Structure formats: structure tokens, C-alpha cells
Amino acid sequence: GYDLSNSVFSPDGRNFQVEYAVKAVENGTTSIGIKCNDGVVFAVEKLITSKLLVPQKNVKIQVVDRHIGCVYSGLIPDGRHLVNRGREEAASFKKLYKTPIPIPAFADRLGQYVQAHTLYNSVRPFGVSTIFGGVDKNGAHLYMLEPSGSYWGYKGAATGKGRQSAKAELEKLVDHHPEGLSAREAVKQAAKIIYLAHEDNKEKDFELEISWCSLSETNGLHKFVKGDLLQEAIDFAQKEIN
Amino acid sequence: MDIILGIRVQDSVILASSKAVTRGISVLKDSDDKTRQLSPHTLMSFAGEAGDTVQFAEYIQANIQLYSIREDYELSPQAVSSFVRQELAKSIRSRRPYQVNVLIGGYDKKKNKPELYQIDYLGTKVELPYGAHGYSGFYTFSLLDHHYRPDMTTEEGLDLLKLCVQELEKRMPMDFKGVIVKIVDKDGIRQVDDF
Amino acid sequence: TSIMAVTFKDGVILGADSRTTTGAYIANRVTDKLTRVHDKIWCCRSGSAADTQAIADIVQYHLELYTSQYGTPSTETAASVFKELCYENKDNLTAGIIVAGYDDKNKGEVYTIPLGGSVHKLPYAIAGSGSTFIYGYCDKNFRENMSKEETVDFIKHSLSQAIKWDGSSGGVIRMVVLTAAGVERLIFYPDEYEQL
Amino acid sequence: TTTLAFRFQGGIIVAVDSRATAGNWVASQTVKKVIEINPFLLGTMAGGAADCQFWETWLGSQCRLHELREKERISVAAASKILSNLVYQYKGAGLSMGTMICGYTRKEGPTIYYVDSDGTRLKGDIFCVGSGQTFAYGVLDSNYKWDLSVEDALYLGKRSILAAAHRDAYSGGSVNLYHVTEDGWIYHGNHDVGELFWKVKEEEGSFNNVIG
Amino acid sequence: SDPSSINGGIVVAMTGKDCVAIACDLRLGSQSLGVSNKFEKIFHYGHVFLGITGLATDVTTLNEMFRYKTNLYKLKEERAIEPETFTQLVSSSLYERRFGPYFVGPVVAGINSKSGKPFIAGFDLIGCIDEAKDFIVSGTASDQLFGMCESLYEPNLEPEDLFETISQALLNAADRDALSGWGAVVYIIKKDEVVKRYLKMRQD
């Protein structure tokens, strides 16, 4: 009985609250982040859970500043608040120093703010894993941030319901290329590994959304993949699964 | 500033205040009093700044009577005097200046002696056998010193005070239309309609 | 009080004197106005003696904390700081700083911050109150692109014309050399250049 | 700008002029200075027009709300000593006022209190306030009876406003009269100063300063 | 005008051998008008004696300010306050306002009970210890005094030698002043018995 508050400790080193918050994120949807040499490719699965829905008119991938993508799973409103905070913190940096916030510096602001909510009984811990990275001038980076206020570097990261499958396919892809792959070429691979990660969850039907921050094709600003490129990526994955 | 004189008679304090009130360049009223009875046995008269006087005068009656009803006994004139001093003292330091010169006169029935006090606008308490503020003070301080005696009966204190009134009228360029007289004594606080 | 900075091919060399008056009375004639706020981002102070020392501690503080969490700040980064304290206290602080510093990639760079507080990158900057006199001497005889040896003689002579005309400038000339190689103070006593 | 009101045995004759200026030229000539606080309270706009008009309207907020709680409308002493504090705070913050609150209650008889920018609250029986208050004072006090008819009391009203109009630069325009009884004020017309002039010169023979 | 010069007030004080002495005039004016010919401006908190000068009101306010603090020390530490600790306290109180400052010039006079030694101090407006073990004076005929006292004073004065010196010094100074005089009250402070004597001198 150590769920009374989020400041309590347990004798097995546990902090029951916070661990239960991971149960919340496991009910999310597959979300990947591809750390490529030229940049980063994010993709999010957007479920069509009804045919009454207007496709490609809802985003779950929002940029914070202009060169940090942030893509989240777990509780969708809760992530919209954690994304909202990091636009304030990001803009403060730009005013105070006239440079856009570095990706490892941004990692610290967000991390620290999530950690804070387990040191006071006044607030509830956030139940999301957020995945963020981009291109800065000290290069491209990728981070996965836990609901615990923990993070590490990643060469590929994943979250969702099909996360067993994603993390697994991502080892194969880092074993194809030990020197890593192009973000140009990564548009077609995010498409592929969300599709195998939906065989567990193939009750529903979905729309693929893909985004990128690359130095080579989107000039370091985080833009959306669209047009013919988007629908070719979908077609790539489909031939692979058949 | 106008008329406001005290004389400490053997058993009483005789205070007197101006009738005339001039705000602007036209006398507007000429039967007004400038005095408010604090307690059954302490009267306070005031003059100083316009409009500061009326408000701040109501303020002291309120507070001293607040304390009177708490303890079902009345403060000594020494004790009320100190309260008025305290407040005005904070007020020359504070943002908005008050500017109220007061003669507090009372009969203390526990020391059995009439007490008269002069509190200037700065915040200086002084016990005196006669007193005055302002413009009037300059002609009378010397006039009262002349004729006084240590012990003088009540109706002698009236006669003297009417010499001081009479003098003032000649000499002051201002017009004050005679005083109102009040005696504060051991037998209560009354007025004399004789001027 | 004369302060300058001039960029060169392999870095930037900063130059100040050491005479600092209040009145007609020279307070100390061996005064040091070339200040460390980081380790490769050095500044030159001119203006109101209290207000430069004040501001400059406050930047020293922001920058060092920047190092400890984020990695070393840039010349760009430090220049912005000094603007952001002048601009928000432009109503009562009289301070014109020159922020000159060596970034790895971009070599030496100069930024100058007016009294009203604003970035200006320049190929060389002068400000003070005795450096108004040498605007013409620097401009004409400035060669864009110089060598290490060429640069020090150029700045030595620029400071000598400034000294000659300003009774608030004199004493020994202090120089800091910021290059990848490191940080080197040079000093010239008056007998050594009043001959030239 | 001149305001006055007087006690008599029939109530309070409150009289005003209807001319105000700005600069040196006449800004309005219809500018009524009778500000209805309540059906039982009249307030008289001299001093700063803005300050007077706004604050007397808000005075009527606190008259209406006092009457809800205690079920008996405000005493004239009590209404005035609401206004005095309000003014008094904006002392050393800069304000302008110069009103009389005129009221007739059944617990206090006729009462007038004069309120001023300074924060004096003075009682009295004749109050003339304004730029031309010296020209009013005179015609008013020289024909003063406590034993007075209500017909003469109006006619006295008029002639103190026409003295005030004749000599003050800034008074004139039109005349409004209100007689405050206990049962509240009744309105006795708007009478042009221009038009008034020649009827009084005709009757009384007065104004032998101005040519025929 | 100047805040100190609106009633006047002088305090003189000198040390002897096994005795100190402090002395004031009694005048309280409101500018040219003399308002009272009696008003003690020395007050005593235990066996320390506090002289207070400068501005009219601030004699009164500041006196009862020390009334309150002396009390806290006496109630707590269960002894009367020593000369030196009270000198420190006055210095601390005057500085408490430096923006909207006091306007007074205290003189601390006492003899320590822990070692049997004279101790005197002086103060300015903003307040600082002004050491002497010779003399200190304060007020607005402090200038006139500084000379008067110097001529007359002799190191190591006897108890009723010290009385004639300080009485004459004060008399002559105050009647060369407008805003002080009208009577003077001299304390002779010994180690066991302090004597209060009013002085017959020019009223006019």
C-alpha cells in the first residue's frame, strides 16, 4: 500500500505510482523515432476508429520551436500539455541567448519538469513517453523520455502496443547498416516497421503519418512528409507485407 | 488657522474655538464648532488644515470611545493625549501628511487635577498652564502670563479669557466673529453661551 | 578610456589602456580593463566604472552556469547577454562593452554593444571616449586580413594616436591575444612607442 | 458656474444656471447641473464636471442599496459622510469637487451639507459655491426670511441666479429651479436668462446700470 | 528650515574622576515662539543617562522607542543595561532609518557597574559612535560649547569641581544662543546617588 502519494517509497525500491504510469503508456499506439546520420524521422500511427473521421486533419506530431519534433503516446491530452510547456521553455532560451535551444539542453528542461512531479504531493505524474529529437549544429540526436523523468540517448527508440515488434525490427536495421542510413531512405522504413507492428493490433485500420528534420532535405527545419512522397512510402510497406 | 486658546484654571480647563470658517475667499459658515467631546471628561479642540481637521477629528473620538466601552472606565487625559500624539507622529513619516494642532483639555478625577496639553502637528506633547496654536498664540502667550495667578477661580478664568478675546479682535487682520466657550470641569462638560 | 578590438586571420587581439580618470584626478595609472568572463570570450570595459564592473559580474555568472549544464557558449551567445542587460536597464546604466572572442570554427569575432544596447558584429570596433579621435586613422590604414605580427603594430599605433589626443588615455597599453593556441598578455610601456 | 440652495420653512429652494464654459468660450448652454442622486436627493455640479457628475451617480448606488438593507432611505448626514471619505482618499492624488447635497428628511428636517475637494463637511443654512459665489451671496442674504412664502422663495431664487448671471463671466444661459419638499422635488421649469432679464427690469425698475 | 533648529536644545556632558556629568536646557520653541520653559530632555533608563537633542517631536518619539527596547533587554537577561551595550543600541536604532532618517543627536553618559569606569559617547544625525573620554556635546549651540568646555576643562576633575565647570560652561553658551537657555538643569552622576539641581540663570 504505497500508492497514497507519489513521494512515498517502498522497501523493494519501487514507487508504485510512477510504475503504474507505464501501464498508461502501453495503451498508446506505435510511435518510432529513427536516428539517422543526416537527421531524424519520426512517424506516428493515427488510428481511424470510425469512418466519420476526416483523415489527415489531425496531427499527433507537433513541433516545438522550428527544429525539434515531439511525438508522444499514452494520454493524448497529457502529452499536449507536456508539448505546450516545452514551447515556453524553448522560446525563453531564444530570447535570452538569441540562439534556438540545443537538443541536449532541451532534453534537460523537459526531464527536470517531469521529475518534479514526483517530489510534490500537489500534482499527479504524467503518463506519457514523449520522443523528441531534431538537427542542431552539433548534429542530429534522439531522446526517449520516460514518465519517470528519465532519459537516455537512443540509436532507435519506440513506444506503443507494437513496441516489442518495432524495437526488434530496429536492431535488424542497425545490423544492416553499422554506419547507419539516409533520412531520405528512412521515410520508406518507418512505413515498413509500423506495418509489422500492427499485426498484433490489426483489429482497426490506420493512416500513416511521417515527419522529418534533416539537414540534407528540409534544411534543418522540421517539416512534414507529404504529397507523392507520403503515398509512395505507404505503397513501399504494403509490398513488403505482401 | 484661527482662534484656539486654553487657560488652566485651578479646577478646570477653559477651551475656546473660532465660529468663523473660511474655505476659499468667502466666509461660508459662522456658527460652526471645531471641537468634539472624546469622553465625558475630556474635550478636544483642533485646528489646522482644511478637511484634514474634520475627518481626523472624528477618527480620535471613535478610537478612544472604542477603548472606553471595552473596559467600562474611561482613559485619563494623559493617556488620550499620548494616543493622539502617537497617531500624528506616524503621519509626518507617512505618505499623506496630516497637519492637526490640538489642545486636549480634561479633568482627571483620579489625579484630581485639571490637565491641559498642547500637541502640535509635528508630534510633541507638553503640559502647560496656558496654551495656544498658530496666529492667535503670538499675541496671547505674553498677555496671559501677565495677569495670571497659580490658583484662580472659574469665573476669574472666564473674565481673563474674555480679555484675551477682546484684544485679539483689534489686533488680528482676520475676523473670527467671537468664540464658542466650553468649560471642562469635574462636574461635567458644559458650554457657556456668553461670549 | 579607449577600448578597441580588431580581428585578424588566426584570431582577434584586444587592446585597452590603463589610465582611468574621475575628474582631472587619475585614480590608478595601471588599471586593467580587459576582463575574463569565460575562458576564450574576453571583454573590454569602457563607460561608467561602476556600471561596467557590475554588469560584467552578472554575465560571468550566467556564462559559467551555461558551461556547466550545456557546454561552452559561443561569442554570439555572450554578446546577446550583454545586450539583454543593457536593454532592460538602458534607463540608468551607461555601459558600452566590446565582446570579442574566439570561437573554434569562426576564429575571432567582435561584437560591440552601445549604451542603448544592441548587437553589431563588426570587422573592428572602437568605443570609449578617447577612441572617437582615431575613427579616421583605423579606417584608412585598416587592411582587411592581417598577420599576427602586423595586427599588434597596427593596434599599438592606433592606441598611440588615441593616447596623444585624450588626457583620459595614457599609461601602459595592455593587449590580450585570443587564438586557438591560447591566451597571451602583451604590454608596452610609453618609452617604447612615443619614439615612434 | 454658480450653485446655491437655502433653507426656509417650506423646504429647500435649489437653483442653478445652465451655462458652463471651457477655455474662454461657452462650451454648452443647456448644461444642467441638477444631478438626481435619488428622488429625495439633489447634488449640484460645480468644480470639475467629470468628477462631480460621476460620483454623484455612484452616490445614488449607495443610497439605493442602503435602502434595501435597512428598509428606510438614507439620512442627509449619512449620505454626505459617504461622499467625504471617497473624496478624501483622492486627496494628494488630485480631485475636484464642489457640491451641496440637499435633502429633506423627517428625522432631520431640511439639511444641506457642503462637501469640498479638501474634505470639509460643513452644515449651514445658506451655501453659495462657484466662480460667481460672491454675486450670489449678496442678493440672497439681503432678503432672507425664515418666515417666507413659497411664491416669494422662487422669485428670490431667480433674482440670485440673475445677479450671478449678470456679473460672473461664466454664469448665465438658463435657470432651473427645484423645490425640495419632504415628498421630494418638484420641477419648476427652465427659464432662459436672456428672456428673464427684460421682465425683471420691467417690474422692479432694477438694472439701472444697463441702458434702456 | 533645518529640522534640529525649530526648538533648539543642547546637551553637554563631561567626565571626571569617579563621576560623569550631563546637563541640558529646558526650552521647547516652535520657531520664534517659546512654548515651554520646562521640558526635561534627559531621561534615564536604569543607571545609563540618555540625552536627546535635535528636532522637537523626535525627542519625544525616540525616547519612548528606547523605552520599549530597554524593557526587552531587562525582562530577558535579568539585569539593568550597561553603558556600552546601550551606546551600541542607540547606534543600531538611529541607522534603522537612513531613508527618511531621524534628526536628533543623543549623548550617552554613564559609569559601568562591572568595572567602575566612566563611559561617554556622542552621536550625529545618521548615527555613529563618537568616542571620547574627555568630552562630547551635541545640540545646536554645540559649536559654542566645543570651545567653552575645552578652555575650562582640566583632566581628572573632582565631583563638585566638575559641577562648577559644567554649570558655567552651559550658562555662557546658552545666552549666546536664541534657541536654547531659559533655565538649565545639571546632573551630577556619581556611583551611588545622582543629584538633580536646577540652575538660576537668565531667562531673557
Place this chain on the structure above:
Amino acid sequence: QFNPYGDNGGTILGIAGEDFAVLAGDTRNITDYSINSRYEPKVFDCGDNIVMSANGFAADGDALVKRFKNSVKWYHFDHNDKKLSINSAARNIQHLLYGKRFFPYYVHTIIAGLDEDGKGAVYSFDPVGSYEREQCRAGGAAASLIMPFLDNQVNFKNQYEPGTNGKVKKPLKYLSVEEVIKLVRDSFTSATERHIQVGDGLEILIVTKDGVRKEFYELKRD
């Protein structure tokens, strides 16, 4: 030193009918002797048959119009689409002014429209607050050339029956909109010569209960 107050000049004219009201003003905008804009209205319709001009110093004029057009949206919202009377608007503005008097506003405001008797309405205002209903009042720079003329021709002032030599007032004028339109323009064409802060463009908003009419008329650019 900073002093936050300027001037943008201009003039307005509110002439209350018996079945309309007319608010007209010049569209010239000046800052000293430089002409800032020819044609840029200072006269605004504020919706639901009330018109609004705050003329004087433009920078204030803007802000005070924008808070009035906010207080319309909020009435419809919290009072369930009740129409907002001329009479109630007049007071509501005075709070808007008074709230910042400690920092003064420097615009004269004339609002107009039709109220619930279907008579013309004009309320005019002083800068630091206060308002008075009048049948006619001018305001702004050139007002004092405009007003004694307007008081002569509308209200028939100092006019008297012939041959009795001033013993009967000349019988009062029944207003109708067409006499009124001619009149506005004749008065303005004069002000524009003799006063140098008026001219260019004239914008006459007419209020009737049938809707709001915008009739623009050019003047000389002299």
C-alpha cells in the same frame, strides 16, 4: 523626457434630428503641418443603430472605439440579444473614460443614433468624463467656427418676427433630413477655408431606423 499625448486634429458635428441623427466629420488627419492621410475615417458605425466618433488625438480615439465595440458583443452575450439603448450607452462610456482619468484621455466623443422614443439623439462628452444631451453640438478643432453658425440656423437663435422689433421669437424649425444634408456641407465648405486642420473628405453617416446610410462627399483639397 517623454510626453505621451499628441494631436491628430480633425472636427466633428452631431446634429440631432426629430426622426434621425447625423454624425459627420472630416477624414483629414494631420500631425502639425505635415498631412498624414487624406482619407482614413475618424467616424465609425458601432452596430445596432449607434454611431461613434472619438475625435481629438487618434491614438486614444482608436482604443476607446475598440472597447465600445467589445461592450456591444458582451451585451448580446450576457443579456440574451437585448438591444442596447443610446441612453444606456452614454453612461457605459463614461465609466470607460473615468477608469483611466489618473492617466488622462484626450478625445471628445460624440455618439448618436435613435432611442426608444424614435427621436434623434446626440450625447457629447468632455475628456475626463461627463456627458450631456443636446440637440446639436460640435467638437474638435474647427468647432467654434461651426457651432454659433449651427445654433443660428437650426435652432433659430436670436431670430424674431419682423416688424414687432423683438417681442416674439421666430417660430421654431421642424427638421427634415434634406434641409439638414445641404446644411452640413455648406457649413463645412466654409470651415475648410478658414481653418487649416479641416478639409479633404467628408463622411456623413446617417442613422435611420431602417438602416445606416453612408453618403461620402468630397470637399476642396485647399
Place this chain on the structure above:
Amino acid sequence: TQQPIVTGTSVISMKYDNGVIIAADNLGSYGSLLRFNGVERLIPVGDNTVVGISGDISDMQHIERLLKDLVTENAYDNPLADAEEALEPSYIFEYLATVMYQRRSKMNPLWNAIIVAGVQSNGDQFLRYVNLLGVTYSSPTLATGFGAHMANPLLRKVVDRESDIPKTTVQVAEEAIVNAMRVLYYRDARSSRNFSLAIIDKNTGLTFKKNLQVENMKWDFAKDIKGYGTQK
């Protein structure tokens, strides 16, 4: 409180058939001492709106920032939300406007005068003024600073009213803005030879012609008069 320290000269501008032209000269003066050269006071926001800021360079920096931040705010949410919920000239105007005003009210002014020049999504011209009082106004010809009645008279002589705008061609507009820089560079003591120039069109968007030089000056006839008219 705030007063001019380091200042620019004048921004000039005019309307033409398919858009607006706006230009400003490149000078940062520190009183008589021309302390800063090569300082650009035209700042593009969007890609059809040039915002040229006059008054102090000091204050300018801190408005240059707010335009960049506004573009960031707008760009948030959908990909349709930057395609066609982009910032407009009329939106940019109001944003600058509203800040300035409130800083004047708190008695610490942002001492600038701003011109916002653009073209609409609806396809219309917008050329508008705001300053350190909060005065707003629109006109077919506009300038700021000393060109408010130096250059401006010349431009207003080309296009007198808003209906002469479809009759004036982009190359006649072009001429007038060059000509009026030359008149500035003559008859005003703080002026620089360098000027930036922008053309905002609604058929090709923003083209930014940087670092034109004022050419074709007359100085031939100041050798035919001598003295103050007393010495030949």
C-alpha cells in the same frame, strides 16, 4: 524615461497596381558621429510582408525578435495552418501596434515608427503606419522620420489618390523610390549612400533587392557660385 540614443533616418514607400515597394537606407547614426554603417532596417516577415522599422536601433532589435516569434506561434498545429492560416500584413500590423501602445501607456516607450507593407491573401494592397503614440493610419503613400515631408511630397505627386493606383505601373513606382532616396541623400545630414529595397508583388511574392547604390547625382554647378554672395 526613454529618448533617442542610436537612430536610423527614414523609411519611404508607395503603392502600385499589383503591390507595394518599401525601402530604407542603411545607417546607424550615433548623433553627428556616423558610428555604424551597413545596418539594415528592412526586416522580412512571412514572404509577402516587409516590416521596416525606424527610430532607434536599440528598440528595433527587440521588435525584430517579436516578428520572428509571431511566425513561430502561427505556424503551430496543422500543415494547413501555415499554408493558408499564415500571417497577413493586417495581422502583423495589429501585433506591432498593440505592444507599442501599452508600452507608451506604462510610460516607457518603444521609440520607433513602423511601416508594414504587404499584400493580402485576398489580393489587395496594404500600406500602413503606427508609431510611439499609437496613432494608426493608412494612405496610398507613406513615410516616416524626416522623409515624412521630404520624400513623401515627391511620391504623393505621382499617385495622388487611390484610383490613380491602377494607372501607375511597377516601373514608374520603381523610378519614384530611387529618385526620392537621391533627394534624401542630398538634403538631409544623416543619410547613407547604401539602401535596401524590396518589392512585394502578389503574382511572384517577395523579391529583396539588397545594397543598391544611389547613382546619378549633380554636383556640376557648385563651381559657378562662390562665397555667401560677397566674395567671388
Place this chain on the structure above:
Amino acid sequence: NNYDGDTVTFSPTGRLFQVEYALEAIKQGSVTVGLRSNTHAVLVALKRNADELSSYQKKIIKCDEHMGLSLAGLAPDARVLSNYLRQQCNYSSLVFNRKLAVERAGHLLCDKAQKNTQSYGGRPYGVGLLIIGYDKSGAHLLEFQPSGNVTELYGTAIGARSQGAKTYLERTLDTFIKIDGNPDELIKAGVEAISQSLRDESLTVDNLSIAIVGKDTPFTIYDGEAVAKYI
């Protein structure tokens, strides 16, 4: 009160139970149906009387003259959010000279739900709003939950019998999208929608309350005998 407590609890199922509970607010509320085309939005609301001497309870609140909301659930809850949407729209009109778009206002709202789930002593609002409008980016219909999720739909419902309205709208979906500049047709198809969502309370010309928004028409609320042309 085990895992089922106040707004701070997890809960080994990743839930918080405060969210599901406030979603029974909606269920206990009266039915509402929204549907949009590319040129018009239409909300068709069922008011609910308390008794026959009681009136009917307003179900549609005007936010702007091109934006409107209609509630389902707790009326006191609605009034804290409705004040909020109108307040940031007038704010966007003042500052940016711009209408506050529907899609963006969903994002603003979203975070306003979140922080009373964040903080201990908070509760989620027990109202779900349907928010229509017409902007510069066209028609949008948002469905707002006590969860704080904003979703964009062609036609949706919330209430009791919400399933029955959505099944009618699944058939007839591609019919109403290709009807444009004929508002009348959309209004009638939504009358027809709420017919499958009757508790035998009937279609009635004072029970049903309509509000529309066009490209070519402001926001307008029809009530009383403005609804008779459909009914």
C-alpha cells in the same frame, strides 16, 4: 477510494477513474447531433423539460458570429468553459485582427482540461461540448470530451442514444458532403438524424433547437417557430 480515488491516482490499469466517471455526466444528459458539409455547419440539439410547467433547457450557446458551441451534460460546468472560448476569441479579434479558428481553439481548451487532472483538489469538467464554426480554413466540427481530446469529424453525437445517430450518419455520409450552398438540406438530414435518438419524446417545434453557420451566412440560432420549415 482504493485506486478509484481523487485526481492523483493510478490505478494498475493505466486509467484514471475520474475521467470515466465524468463521462457518465454526458450519458445522463440529453442527446445532441452535429453534422457538417464543406459550406455549412449545423447543430441539431434536443432540449429537455423538467416538467410541463417548467420550460426547456437551452442547449446551444453562441460564442461568436461565426462560432458556436452546444453543450451536453452539466450546465454549471459548461458555463466555465463557454465564458473561456468567447474570451480568447475577442482577444484574438483585438490583438491579431483575426477570427479565432475552431481547430486552434480545441488546442487551447485541451490544456484547460489537463491541469484540473494534473492538480490535487481538481476535478475534470462533466460537460462535453460540440464546437462548430466557419473560418478562413472552412467548416470544422470538434467533439470535446471530459478527457480533453479534441477530434475532427464529418458528423458525430454525444448524449444517450448517441450510437443510433451515428449509424444514420454512416449510411447517408457521402450524400451530405456533396450537398453544398443549400443549407436547408443539411438541416433536414440532421432532424432525421435525431429521429433515431428519441425516447418517444417526439420531434416538436420547441423541443428541437437548431443553430447553423455558413460561408455566406453568420452564426444564427433558430428556436421557437424558426424550426417549423424542417418540422
Place this chain on the structure above:
Amino acid sequence: TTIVGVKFNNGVVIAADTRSTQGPIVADKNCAKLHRISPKIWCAGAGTAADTEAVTQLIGSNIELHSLYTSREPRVVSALQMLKQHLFKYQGHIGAYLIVAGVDPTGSHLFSIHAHGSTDVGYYLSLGSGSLAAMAVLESHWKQDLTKEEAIKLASDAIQAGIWNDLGSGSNVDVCVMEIGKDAEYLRNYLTPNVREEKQKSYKFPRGTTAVLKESIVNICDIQEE
């Protein structure tokens, strides 16, 4: 008022006058201008006397707090940077001109700090109104590395130049010599000029030569059983 602070090789030596003035009158011919931040970091002050003594007390307390909290001897900078910060807060409505000097494990130091928040460093500095007169002798006689005995004769004779030429400076000459890794020696009254001559007679008066008006006794003894 001449207060000199002169460095030499093995430490720093600081000297002062003891005549403290208030306008044309000499208030006190004997106070000291030398304060003690800390036991081996002495400081002296000049300018408004109240604002020196209070600033030295105020910050004195806080560096001693700190010195316990690190359980280490105080350093010169520690005092110096706290000073700087404090005077700046009021924007130089406080008027202090202190020489702060002292030794510690990490060498000899000597700073001067002006009333706004300015700070300079030299090897010979002087504050005061007499400062000018000091400075003249200091710049000629000084040389790099002095011994202790030489440094105290330069110090003293620099204040004496001060005495003679500057009205407001006079009285005794104090010294406090601070030398690295040996205790700090206070040499009060090192060299004393300005001895007052004997009076030409004494002015002792016999009893009763001033009038008395009346007599009472004031009782300063505590309240006791009667």
C-alpha cells in the same frame, strides 16, 4: 583625513589619522577609522563616518558566519565582493571609500572600493580628502619589494604629509601591519604630534560661584522594600 594602504613584499601595512571632523569644527581628536572585517583582514574607512562603520559591522558579521561555515580562515575577496554588491544596491546613496587590505594563505591583497561600486587594484592606494597629499610622497619614495621596517616608515611619513597640508587631517598615526603567516600587530599611537600645550592658569572655580535654584535627589537605584 589621510588613510594610506601600501603593499610591500611580505605583507601590507595600513595607516590612518585619528582626527575625525564634522564641518569647520573638530568633533573628536580621538576615534579610529580602522575597523576589523576579520582578525587578519583589517580595513579603514573614510567619507561619511556612519556609513563606513555600519557597512564594516554589517558585512563583518557575515564574513565571520561564512568563515565558521567553511571552517576556514576568511579571504580578502570574500569581504571585498560582498561589499561591492551591497553598495551598488542603493546606487551610491551610501558613501563609502574603504581601503580593504589583508593577508591570507594565498597571498597579500589590497583593494580600494568607491561609493557607487567601483573597484581598482594597485600596490599603493589612498582614500580620504587628504588622499592627494599622501599620494605625492608615495609615488616618489616607493619602490618594488620593501622590508617591514621601511614599509612602516613610508606609511607614517605619508600620513604626516597629510597632516601638515590637509586641515582635516591630524592627530596620532595608527598602524596595523599584516604579514603572511604571522599574527597582525596593532601599533596605536606610533608617532604622536599635535600635543596640546599647558593652559596658562587653571580655571577651577570654588563652590557656589554659580547660582542654584533648588535641590532634589534623583534616585536611580531599583525599587526595594521601604
